[PDB]
Structures are given as structure tokens and as C-alpha cells.
Amino acid sequence: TCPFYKKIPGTGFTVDAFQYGVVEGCTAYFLTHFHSDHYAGLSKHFTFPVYCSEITGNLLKNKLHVQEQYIHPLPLDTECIVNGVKVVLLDANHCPGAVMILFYLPNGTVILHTGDFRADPSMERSLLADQKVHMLYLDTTYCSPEYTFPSQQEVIRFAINTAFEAVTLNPHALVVCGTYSIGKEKVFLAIADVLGSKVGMSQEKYKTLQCLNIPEINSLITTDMCSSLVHLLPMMQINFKGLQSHLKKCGGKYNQILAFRPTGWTHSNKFTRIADVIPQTKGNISIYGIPYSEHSSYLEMKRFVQWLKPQKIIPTVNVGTWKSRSTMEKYFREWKLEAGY
């Protein structure tokens, strides 16, 4: 049965609610982004209207084989009508195609559903500023003060400098980047751009990237592994064993690997500045763990919510345990007392 946190009250709308079969009373199913926990249940067998961004629609058609008749793409930053209700999709600063949805209810209530997001100050100067938002459905992935991380830009600058140095020292070194879903494409795109290369990958991953509306993409990526000095592999294969095996496959064209593992947070974010990062090394393979997040830090989340001043918050992440719900409720009350709403 569909949870209350996936229903928009006073409409027949749901958000990210595809794993429950037919939801009784639902006339329009929104999909915030193409991550499998959110699209779970969608397939060529789905026959109700799905509303989403253009990029998400491209993925639904080509990767999941959802029939075109049921895909309803909407543009961003544009007031649209769906089933007699005014809605706006906003960029979520998550993965490609990911949106937040603003619902303008017939009774006059305004609801923001963030989907998955990485809060940013630029959101305080969007259409959200034009009116009061009463209810917030919030991505609470990192809703605890220990979760700090660097900016995306600091992480990219580190990755670019690291790769340029290693390949200038050894022109026969290969760079490898791990991946398992869409998101975090700037890691590999920026390293390839500094090295004057295309990015090589599997046919399945190339197909995915060709759905993302990236300008000039044919100049940036290829399925010809041989021609390229930045390669993508599944995250699972970024270990000494998998990287040695891969080096064997390339026809001795490279004698060394430098690899990146973009992660979420792990325990050592608590001490180590990006400049201090050092890799794990075994012989001619070195691997760097880099904390590249597409979710809000605690401080980013707190800033956004204290700016928005919602009357009610409904979390969408870590809601399966009481302990987690209680802890989140405590932070929400702190933030409200501090900021005066």
C-alpha cells in the first residue's frame, strides 16, 4: 500500500509511487528522477500517465521501454496545468533530469516536493520566492550534523589536478572512473577535458548518456575503448583485482591505472580536507576515494528550510524507523525556534 508521504493531498497525484501496483484514486503519477528506488515498478507494462522532465522521459522510453503514449514531459521553470491543477518543475541540482515539483492546490495551499536534491542558495532566487510554501516534502538523506562535505567544485578541481599530474608524469597511464547509475557525470567529463580525450565506455552506458541532452555529447564520449584515455567501469570493479584484469584487456596499451571512486559520505569526512587526500596503492594501480555528493549536506539543508519557513515538513528519506523519525523531528523544531517561524 502507497504511503502518505507519496500522496499530494487534494489531488489525484502521487510522486515516485510505482511499486504498489494500481494506486486507488491516482490519475497522474509524477517521477522526480531516473534512480531505480524512485522508478521501481515502471516497465513496458505500465499504462497510466507519467509526468516528468524531458531527460527523464528519454530514459523511460529508451532504457525501460515505457510506451510513448504514457510519457508526458514538461519543461522546467514554466507554469503548466495537469488534470486541472497548476504545477511547476524546478531543477533539483541532483542527477541529470532530476526535478523538484511545486503544486498550487485548488484550495490555495502551496506544496513543494524536493524529490532528491542538493540544496543551493540559487534556489532562494527561483519561483519559490514568489509566494509562501505551506508544506515541504523533504529529501532528508543527510539530516544530521556530522554530514559535512566539500563543494562539487573543490572535488572536481582536485580530480583534474590529480589526473593531469599523473598522466604528464606517465603518458602510458590510463584513468578509470567508477559509476552505477546516472549522476556525477562531471567527474569523468572534467578529467577527460583536461587530458584532451573522449571518455570510453560500454554500449549500455553510452546509450544512457545519449539520453541526457548534454551539449556536444558526440565530441565527448565513445564506445571505442582503444581510442580513449579515460574509461568508465562499474563501481564494483574499482578494486586492485578488477583494475589489474582491466589493464590486461587493453592490449598492453597502458602500463598503469589511476582510478577514482566517487562516493557518498563515509566515516573519514569528519577530519580530512580535500587537499589532504591520499590514495590507496598496490603496485602500478592507485585508487582515490572522492566525496562527490548530489544530496544536501546538513548545513545546506538547514539553510534552505530556514529560508523557506514551511508550516509543515514531511520527510521522504529514513522514514522506516521511529528512532530516525524522532531524531529528524528534533532538528526541525530546533531550526524553527532559531529562525522564528
Ligand code: NI
Ligand atoms: Ni536519487
